[PDB]
Ligand binder design. Structure first.
Ligand SMILES: [Ca+2]
Length: 111
């Protein structure tokens, strides 16, 4: 199965929002290899977080990653209009799929 994500998360400018990503003990709960990606419409995906909480360069420190048990979370602090995009998680898995992805969350920013 895919990782479970909410279809839609919204916020006002300046709000802190969190996107959940739920798997199992064979993926999100078994390893520290959770990544998060941002995709604006018609653009290439961008790696925002890897290894649960690590940011590549060029990613705002307003983005942070964590996990607890079988659920990973992406938190966006100080929400800005430019954050309106789709967000996906992935995890390494012990299974043959090797990596498993979430179904994606559309973030809408008020205004
Ligand atoms: Ca908007």
């Amino acid at each position: 199965s895919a990782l479970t994500q909410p279809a839609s998360v919204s916020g006002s400018p300046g709000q802190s929002i969190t996107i959940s990503c739920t798997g199992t003990s064979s993926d999100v709960g078994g390893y520290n290899y959770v990544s998060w990606y941002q995709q604006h419409p018609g653009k290439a995906p961008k790696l925002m977080i890897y290894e649960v909480s690590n940011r590549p360069s060029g990613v705002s420190n307003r983005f942070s990653g964590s996990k607890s048990g079988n659920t990973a979370s992406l938190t966006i602090s100080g929400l800005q209009a430019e954050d309106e995009a789709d967000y996906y998680c992935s995890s390494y898995t012990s299974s043959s799929t090797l990596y498993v992805f979430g179904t994606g969350t559309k973030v809408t920013v008020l205004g």
